Structures are given as structure tokens and as C-alpha cells.
């Protein structure tokens, strides 16, 4: 509630860099979202630990 | 397996009784029609007017 009244997704564009607000995603699910600050993605996650545990098992 | 060769089959026996009677909805070969060759009269098209 502190971040302010929920916003519609179409109006998220006004958010400042790294500002966090409340938006309605899905078919009526209000969640707190933020803009990204670190230029990464979900693909590279687990790769380092993947190779580490692969070495450990073998 | 019973052999079937040119002699076994027989005709199908019809039921006996009185002759059967017509049951069609309408007359087929005994109908008569009152004709108008060209319906060019007023208010044409309505079945009652043509009749």
C-alpha cells in the first residue's frame, strides 16, 4: 500500500528508472513490480552452479 | 462350412393375406390438377389467389 494506488499496465511507461509501483497483471492480480537495474536475464541463471555440480557429480 | 453352389438358394416367401393398400401422404399417379397457363392476374403469387 505504501507505494501508492495500483496502476494499469498501459501506464507503467511513466515509471522512472528503478522506481517500484503496484500494477495489475494477469486477470486481476495486483503485484509490486520494479524496473530493472542490472542488464542480465533469466537465461544465464544456474549455468555456473550447473557446471559446478556437474563437475562435482563426475 | 456349407457349400453354396447354384442349387442351394431359394426365393424369399412373401406373407399371405389380402392385397396391400396405398399409404402415401398424397395421390401420385391418380391426381388431377386445375391449371392456369399464365397467372397474370392482380395480386399474383399468394397461394389463395392462385387457388
Amino acid at each position: 500500500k505504501r507505494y501508492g494506488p495500483a496502476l494499469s499496465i498501459n501506464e507503467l511507461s511513466n515509471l522512472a528508472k528503478g522506481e517500484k509501483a503496484n500494477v495489475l497483471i494477469g486477470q486481476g492480480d495486483v503485484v509490486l513490480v520494479m524496473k530493472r537495474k542490472r542488464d542480465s536475464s533469466i537465461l544465464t541463471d544456474s549455468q555456473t552452479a550447473t557446471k559446478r555440480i556437474r563437475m562435482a557429480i563426475n | 462350412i456349407e457349400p453354396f453352389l447354384r442349387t442351394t438358394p431359394r426365393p424369399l416367401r412373401l406373407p399371405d393375406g389380402p392385397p396391400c393398400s396405398q399409404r402415401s401422404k398424397f395421390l401420385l399417379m391418380d391426381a388431377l390438377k386445375l391449371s392456369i397457363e399464365d397467372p397474370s392476374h392482380e395480386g399474383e403469387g399468394i397461394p389463395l389467389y392462385d387457388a
Binding site: 495500483a6 486477470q27 486481476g28 495486483v30 | -
Partner: protein
């Protein structure tokens, strides 16, 4: 001279001109051949075939039950259900031996299906015997009513949303000591009614088949559904089966089997084909046999899976058959007619009934419990077709030369109802011995082949489920000519469906070019008559004729107007696949084009995606442009639910706030009401921000939303 078209079969072989031996093109308009007496005959004959078995008394319903399994070997050629469990197990063992891993993979796929399925699937069935109201009702309404009763009886496993959860709920219900049914009186004033059912009454209601052929209740839908999934999985991997393939694959299967059996035959081997039907399929299929074969199929499997698959035959083996409406009594002296329900048939004198009905009632009285007859042996149609096909394919596969140990050997298909064997052997003595062995083995397994309906001729010609094979040429008449009349959805939908069905018949149903042209002509005439959309120029004086005439007198490019607006038909074998509005889009006048396609017209309605540009008949999909001519026609029209439309009312007003709900199954963890509340608050805020809404509406909306919040919290 007397016309006698049957003589035509002296030049044109029967198979080539078989179209002449099929009288009707469509459903004959009488739909007769069913009644309570028929159910009595079925019960009596089923218990007759199995009479020599053991007689037992069930401990729950108290009804007598029959057990022909492992009975004495048949001594005569009359139909006998005295199947042996050892023999069916050996046959299944050989079938697995010749197709290793089929049972296992089928079991894995069935396990997946069990895990992922949902409750709402049971709303896709046909007319169902709602036990709660004790009458036939739609699948959807019957399921809603059963859910309501279970909820009122403290059973809400199905609330999770899984079919197996509903099965566990039924499990809980049938062990319950008493069931309470609540009903409303909808006018004049409304009241309430409560009814209490003991354990035995509800048990009997669960194991009942309302006969109208028969339909079981929601209790026994899921188990048969899962057993059918298993049987379909097994059959999909069998070459000799005949299900669940379509029209095109049947011809390929027939050709494959016939070529395999004929070409492999050497110059010194004689081949024969037996086109055959089964004496009485569902009246000699003991449920115990299916239970034994399912036990063999699900060897070395999770116990829960084995039990879920074994419930269905267990449930069916102690089933009850209802006796329909009853009987009608007429007195000529006073021209007085009355209806006697079948319930009292147990305790009514035997003087109002003719001799045949007297015999039926005398035979069926000892088996009558609470107005329902206990039919342990035998089965009903439309439920265990695939498992029976599996058993037939097993006995066929037993014919491989290795098993027979002798020169003769057989093969062929099996589609449950009918079949086509093929036997190879050195001499006619070998053919006779092979057919004798096949017949005796089918008898031992408990299968009777109709000796009258089955005939044997040298390989090259046969029939199989209305597919006539003659020296390589296969003629298809399983469904015959379809319905070329307007289906009756709306203007555009009917036009598209008609053209598409003509096209599909041309592609698949071997229809001709001239035949297609004539079908199109007939369809367009029928369409124009039905929808009062005759040509703007022509004078036919219908209700719609004046406005069409005004439109025609208004436009300029009269070749562009739709058929339903008074325009020429422009279809042909060329453009059957082109939707109408596109096919003449270029010719359309600017003003007519704008009006016809104005999306703000009040006559256009779109339903959920599953019912958009698709019609249920099996179902078919059609292409059309959503124009003003896409309207929807008017609808025509003891209940547990107080308001039958509560669910429909609830789903609506979800589409409003969330239109996407109509397109894709919406997913979310928040309850619905909070979803509408948040969406409404956001929409009202943004609406105020824009300037199209004033302060009073904002205040009203927020007060209302707060009040809804308080109402839902409490």
C-alpha cells in the same frame, strides 16, 4: 415392361452399385424400436445365456447375481457366455508376447491422462441419468446437481478441480450412511423439500441404468472413461484393430491386411475370407472377463492405478437396469387410458398383460429390486467397445503360425461389432480345420460369431463396417450422403458450412464435379427460401422482399451484394473454399461495404472461442467474416440448484472487467471478487484522470468498492 432395378446386378457387380441398396439419405423420420418391454427381453436373454453359472446373493443391494465364468464347457452352438479366465489370460499372454511393451506404454499414457484430467470433462457427455432427481438430465446440469448434493452432504474434494478428486468424492459418498437431497419449489410461493436416502437406496441409485440405449449416472462415468482411455491407448498400437481411426485410415488398413494375407500366400496355398458379425456382443461380455484382462494388463503397476482401472468392471458387474416409464392400459368400454409406472410392476397382477408380456414379467420378477432389475452378466453398448476390440484382436493374433503348430493360420481385423477373418491352409480340409479352431477358441474366450450373418468366400472380396472390398476397390457407405440443408446457425455460418461440407465431400467422400454443382444449386435455393433473402430483382412477396427491393434499387454494383442481401451466387468448384464476403469484396459498393461491415452494429454477437466459427454436429470448423449477418437466433425454453444460472451469471461480469477471460482460460490465485474490485478501482481512477468522469461518479465508485470489500471480508 416392368422396372426391376435389382436385375441391374447382373451386369454391374453388387459392390460397384451398392449405393442402390441403401434406401435413406439421412435420418428416417420415425426413430422407433425401444421401450420397457425391450429392456425386459434384454435382461431375460442375458440371464438365459449365462443361466448355467453360479447364483449368488450380493451383500449390499441384496440382489441375486449370476457368474458364468469358468462354467461348464459349451456343448451346443447356442450363444454362451461361459468364458474361462485361464484361457483369456493365456490369450493376453500371447498377445503381449507378440507385441512386447504395448501394455506398459499404454499404462504410462493412461497414468498421464488420469493425472492431468479435470472434472468438467464430464460435462461433455450425452444425456445422463441424474440420480439426485431420479431422471435423465443434461451432462452439465447433472454434474452441477451432483456437485450441489455432494456439497450439501459435506463432500467437496471435487472443489480442487480434478476428475480423480471427483472420483474420490464419489468413493466417500457411496460409503456414507445416508444422503440428504434438497429441492426447491419454483411456484404462488416457493418452499423447500428434504429427502433422506439410506445406504442401500443410494447404492442402488448409483448402480442404475436409466433406459430410454441406457445411460449410467455420474457415479460410473469417470471409471469407464479411464478404462476407455486405456483401451484406446492399447488399440492405437495394434494394427489389427479398427478403432479409433477415421474413414481414410480404414481403407489403408483393409488394403494392408488383404495384400499381406494374399501375396504371402504361395502357389500351393489356399486362402479364404470370412466376413462375419458377432451373435450378441454386449450380452455375452461378462464384466469378470474384462476385470481379469485388466488385471493382466496392469501387472506390476502402482496400486492406485490398478484400483482406479479395476473399479469400472467391478461397478459394472453388480449394475442395475431401470425399466423406463412403465406401461399403458386402455379400456375400450369406457375409452379410459392410464399409465402404470414400472415400479409397481413387481406387485401387480398378471391379467392386464398379454402372454408374451406375462412370460417376461414372470421371468423378470425374481430379479427385480426396488423397481430395477439386477443384471450382473452381460454388458450394455457404447461403453466397453475398445476393450472388447482388444480381446478380439488378441484372439486373432493367437492365429500366428507358431501358435497353431499346424499348416493353417489366420489373421484379419476386428472392430468389436463385426470382423473379417482370413485363413490360409494347404487344402480345403486345412481351411475347415483352421476355421473350426478359430471358432472353438472364440467360444472358449466367450465370443460368439453370428453364423447366419457370417459368410466365407475365397480371398479378394469382403465387407467390414460398411466398407465393401472387391478386388482392391473399397466402397465407403458408413455414413452415406450428409445433410446439405442449411445447418441453422445463422446466415453466414450456414453458408460457410454448406460450401465447406460440399468441398469436404468432394475431397474425401469421392463426390463428383457435377454432383457438387447440383448440391451447391440445391443448397443456394434452400438458403434463399429459408432466410427470405430472394433476389432483389425477383418478385416472391416474402416479408423481407420490400426492403431487399429498396436496397437493390439503391445500390449500383448489384453483383457485389451478398446472397442474403439479394445478390447473385458466385460459387463453383473453383472457389468453394473462399468465404463469401471476401469472394465478392472487390465488387462491393462503398456505402454497402461500410454499412454491412460496421462493427458498431447491434446485431453481431461473439461467444467463447470454443464456439466461435465452429459448429457441433463430432464438430466442424468454418471460415466467415463477422458482418451484420452474424446474428444469433432466439433461444427456446424438481431442481437442486436454487438458481440454475448462478454459475453462468458468475462467469459473466468477469468477461466485462477482463475481456481476455473469453479468449483464454484465465489463471490467477486471487479470488474473483477482489479481481473485479481492483480492476474497477483502476479503471475509475484513470477515467477520472482523463476528464470524461466527474467527482460524483468517482466518489460513488469508491464507496461501492469499499462496501463490496466489507461485504466480502465478513
Amino acid at each position: 415392361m416392368d422396372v426391376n432395378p435389382t436385375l441391374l446386378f447382373l451386369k454391374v457387380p453388387v459392390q460397384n452399385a451398392i449405393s442402390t441398396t441403401f434406401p435413406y439419405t439421412g435420418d428416417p423420420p420415425y426413430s422407433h424400436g425401444t421401450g420397457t418391454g425391450y429392456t425386459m427381453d434384454t435382461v431375460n436373454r442375458t440371464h438365459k445365456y449365462s443361466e448355467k453359472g453360479k447364483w449368488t446373493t450380493n451383500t449390499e443391494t441384496g440382489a441375486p447375481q449370476l457368474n458364468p465364468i469358468d462354467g461348464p464347457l459349451p456343448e451346443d452352438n447356442e450363444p454362451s457366455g461361459y468364458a474361462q479366465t485361464d484361457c483369456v489370460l493365456e490369450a493376453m499372454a500371447f498377445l503381449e508376447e507378440s507385441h512386447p511393451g504395448i501394455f506398459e506404454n499404454s499404462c504410462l499414457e493412461t497414468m498421464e491422462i488420469v493425472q492431468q484430467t479435470r472434472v468438467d470433462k464430464l460435462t461433455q457427455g450425452r444425456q445422463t441419468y441424474d440420480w439426485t432427481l431420479n431422471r435423465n438430465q443434461p451432462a452439465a446440469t447433472a454434474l452441477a446437481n451432483t456437485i450441489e448434493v455432494f456439497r450439501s452432504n459435506g463432500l467437496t474434494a471435487n472443489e480442487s478441480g480434478r476428475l480423480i478428486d471427483f472420483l474420490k468424492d464419489v468413493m466417500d459418498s457411496m460409503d456414507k450412511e445416508e444422503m440428504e437431497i434438497t429441492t426447491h419449489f419454483q411456484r404462488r410461493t416457493i418452499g423447500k423439500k428434504k429427502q433422506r436416502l439410506n445406504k442401500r437406496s443410494y447404492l442402488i441409485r448409483a448402480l442404475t441404468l436409466n433406459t430410454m440405449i441406457a445411460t449410467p449416472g455420474m457415479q460410473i462415468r469417470g471409471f469407464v472413461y479411464f478404462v476407455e482411455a486405456l483401451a484406446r491407448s492399447i488399440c492405437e498400437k495394434l494394427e489389427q484393430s479398427g478403432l479409433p481411426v477415421g474413414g481414410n485410415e480404414k481403407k489403408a488398413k483393409l488394403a494392408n491386411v488383404v495384400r499381406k494375407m494374399m501375396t504371402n500366400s504361395q502357389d500351393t496355398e489356399l486362402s479364404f475370407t470370412i466376413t462375419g458379425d458377432n451373435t450378441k456382443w454386449n450380452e455375452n461380455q461378462n464384466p469378470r472377463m474384462f476385470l481379469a484382462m485388466i488385471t493382466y494388463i496392469t501387472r506390476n503397476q502402482p496400486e492406485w492405478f490398478r484400483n482406479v482401472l479395476s473399479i469400472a468392471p467391478i461397478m459394472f458387474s453388480n449394475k442395475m437396469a431401470r425399466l423406463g416409464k412403465g406401461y399403458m392400459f386402455e379400456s375400450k368400454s369406457m375409452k379410459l387410458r392410464t399409465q402404470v409406472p414400472a415400479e409397481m410392476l413387481a406387485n401387480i397382477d398378471l391379467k392386464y398383460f398379454n402372454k408374451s408380456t406375462r412370460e417376461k414379467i414372470e421371468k423378470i420378477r425374481p430379479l427385480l429390486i426396488d423397481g430395477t432389475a439386477s443384471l450382473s452378466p452381460g454388458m450394455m453398448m457404447g461403453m466397453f467397445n475398445m476393450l472388447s476390440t482388444v480381446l478380439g484382436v488378441s484372439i486373432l493374433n493367437l492365429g500366428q503360425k507358431k501358435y497353431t503348430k499346424t499348416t493353417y493360420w489366420w489373421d484379419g481385423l476386428q472392430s468389436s461389432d463385426d470382423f473379417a477373418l482370413i485363413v490360409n491352409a494347404p487344402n480345403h480340409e486345412g481351411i475347415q480345420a483352421g476355421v473350426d479352431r478359430f471358432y472353438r477358441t472364440c467360444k472358449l474366450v466367450g465370443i460368439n460369431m453370428s453364423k447366419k450373418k457370417s459368410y466365407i468366400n475365397r480371398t479378394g472380396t469382403f465387407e467390414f463396417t460398411s466398407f465393401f472390398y472387391r478386388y482392391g476397390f473399397v466402397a465407403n457407405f458408413s455414413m452415406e450422403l450428409p445433410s446439405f440443408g442449411v445447418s441453422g446457425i445463422n446466415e453466414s455460418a450456414d453458408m460457410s458450412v454448406g460450401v465447406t461440407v460440399i468441398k469436404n465431400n468432394m475431397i474425401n467422400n469421392d463426390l463428383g464435379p457435377a454432383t457438387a454443382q447440383m448440391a451447391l444449386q440445391l443448397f443456394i435455393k434452400d438458403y434463399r427460401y429459408t432466410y427470405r433473402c430472394h433476389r432483389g430483382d425477383t418478385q416472391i412477396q416474402t416479408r423481407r422482399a420490400f426492403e431487399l427491393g429498396k436496397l437493390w434499387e439503391q445500390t449500383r454494383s448489384k453483383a457485389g451484394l451478398l446472397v442474403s442481401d439479394g445478390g447473385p451466387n458466385l460459387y463453383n468448384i473453383r472457389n468453394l473454399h473462399i468465404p463469401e464476403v471476401c469472394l465478392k469484396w472487390e465488387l462491393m459498393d462503398e456505402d454497402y461495404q461500410g454499412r454491412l461491415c460496421n462493427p458498431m452494429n447491434p446485431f453481431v454477437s461473439h461467444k467463447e472461442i470454443d464456439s466461435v466459427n465452429n459448429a457441433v454436429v463430432k464438430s466442424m470448423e468454418y471460415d466467415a467474416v463477422a458482418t451484420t449477418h452474424s446474428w444469433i437466433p432466439k433461444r427456446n425454453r424438481r431442481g437442486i440448484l436454487e438458481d440454475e444460472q448462478m454459475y453462468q451469471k458468475c462467469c459473466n461480469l468477469f468477461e466485462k472487467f477482463f475481456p481476455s477471460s473469453s479468449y483464454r482460460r484465465p489463471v490467477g490465485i486471487s479470488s474473483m471478487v477482489e479481481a473485479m474490485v481492483s480492476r474497477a478501482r483502476i479503471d475509475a481512477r484513470i477515467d477520472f484522470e482523463s476528464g470524461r468522469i466527474k467527482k460524483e461518479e468517482f466518489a460513488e465508485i469508491m464507496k461501492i468498492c469499499s462496501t463490496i470489500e466489507e461485504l466480502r471480508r465478513q
